[PDB]
Amino acid sequence: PNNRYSFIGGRTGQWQVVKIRNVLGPGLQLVEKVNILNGAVAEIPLDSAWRLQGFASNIRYAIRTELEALQAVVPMLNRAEAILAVLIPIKKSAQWWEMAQDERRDIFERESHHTAVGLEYLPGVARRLLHCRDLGEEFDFLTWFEFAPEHSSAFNELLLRMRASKEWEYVEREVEVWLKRL
Amino acid sequence: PNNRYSFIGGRTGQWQVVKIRNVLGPGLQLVEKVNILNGAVAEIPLDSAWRLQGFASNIRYAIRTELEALQAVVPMLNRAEAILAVLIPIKKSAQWWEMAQDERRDIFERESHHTAVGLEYLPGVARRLLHCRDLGEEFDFLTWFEFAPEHSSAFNELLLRMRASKEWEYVEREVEVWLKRL
Ligand code: HEM
Ligand code: HEM
């Protein structure tokens, strides 16, 4: 299997763009669809507005008991019912990346309860975390969420709780690409 | 700045290959020299035998007090006297990468005291850690050490201690490329 994923905003793809919300910092040009490829894409179709990419990686913060709680409720991607998705690219500040591992873990979970909060929205919400700072990309992470319409309200609630977190004080660019499965 | 480094084994470079010691698992072909480039190289050069690459990244394990101690004593790269170097590509097992963050930190420092042991030798040894599992490379890490002859015996003692640690029970491929500055 290949750990690289590419998200190309343009006129083709498996996902229709519903809405792009430019939450913080420079946004992303509106496009019609998102095409998702499991691999690297050196050059995009010239009818494409942007390309984002990241890799699936190892665990950086979650501890064993947290992983065991997640595994108990985590849903799979590509559920038939999960016709809504959101792609949320995120960039954190240089101050964050300069911090040591204990400092970042303390903000992520002991102060912000990132995993404990997210667990409350499983199994409704399926997700994929990709990393891209080490690729030299403009964002540091591509986060992906998908779910049935019955969980839209809960997901909006989750977003409000996260954006109010200490961890968010270090986010410096964020965009939401709302999607509907074709 | 560019976070990517390539190490090309072949007939050109800043470092002469003294010997290659294929410590564990498949080795690396003997070559005359190692060429180090602060950038990606798309393909292995025609007459070169291999191309290793990795990126400099954020801290994964060290805590603030450890980083303070390290940053206070580590020497700069390219000291006049640091005419010896060793490039040690390392691969860890799938069992390692499936462990959680607390499980890996506990092996890396609580059990093995990797940083505390390294610190004993670090005043005279300049180091660079690079990551490459996430690039799809055959190794997980490229580690780089350079020092004066005066520190050769001490560096071998460090290697003796590290290969006996709990951490290295998870190393599954390792090569030593011993070098001398041209
Ligand atoms: C839906 C429930 C969620 C759960 C269960 C959850 C869980 C997790 C876990 C366990 C990690 C740590 C992975 C590791 O240790 O490497 C993580 C990372 C991350 N999550 Fe969430 N998450 C959820 C929702 C969200 C949302 C809604 C966002 C964005 C608004 C988000 C953004 C991120 C980011 C940016 C990271 C990377 C943090 C870093 O490495 O600095 N998560 N998530
Ligand atoms: C010379 C003194 C040394 C010091 C001060 C030292 C220090 C460190 C530190 C602080 C890290 C963790 C960086 C982080 O938190 O991400 C690290 C990682 C690593 N070091 Fe060393 N080290 C030394 C020698 C060595 C040697 C001789 C080897 C190889 C034989 C080695 C192989 C590694 C590897 C493979 C990693 C990555 C571990 C992982 O992420 O699983 N180190 N080192």
Author numbering:
A (entry chain B), B (entry chain A): 1 to 182
The authors write:
The two clades exhibit differences in (i) oligomerization, with clade 1 proteins being homopenta- or homohexamers6−10 and clade 2 representatives forming homodimers,11−14 and (ii) subunit structure, with “long” clade 1 Clds being composed of an N-terminal and a C-terminal heme b-carrying ferredoxin-like domain and “short” clade 2 proteins lacking the α-helices of the N-terminal domain. The only charged amino acid in the hydrophobic distal heme cavity is a fully conserved arginine (R173 in NdCld and R127 in CCld), which is proposed to be flexible and to switch between two conformations during catalysis, i.e., pointing toward either the heme iron (“in”) or the substrate entry channel (“out”).4,6,8,11,14,16 Importantly, the hydrogen-bonding network of this catalytic arginine is different in clade 1 and clade 2 Clds. In clade 2 Clds, R127 is H-bonded to Q74 located on a flexible α-helical loop, which in general connects the N-terminal and C-terminal ferredoxin-like domains in porphyrin-binding α + β barrel proteins.
As typical for a clade 2 Cld, its distal arginine 127 is hydrogen-bonded to glutamine 74. The latter has been exchanged with either glutamate (Q74E) to arrest R127 in a salt bridge or valine (Q74V) that mirrors the setting in clade 1 Clds. The Q74V variant mirrors the situation in the clade 1 representative NdCld and should exhibit an increased flexibility of R127 compared to that of wild-type CCld, whereas Q74E might arrest the catalytic amino acid by forming a salt bridge. By contrast, in clade 1 Clds the corresponding residue [Q123 in NdCld] turns away from R173 due to a different conformation of this loop (loop colored blue). We provide the crystal structures of Q74V and Q74E and demonstrate the impact of the mutations and pH on heme coordination and active site architecture by ultraviolet–visible (UV–vis), electron paramagnetic resonance (EPR), and electronic circular dichroism (ECD) spectroscopy. Besides heme coordination, the mutations are shown to have a strong impact on the thermal stability of the heme cavity but an only weak effect on the chlorite degradation activity.
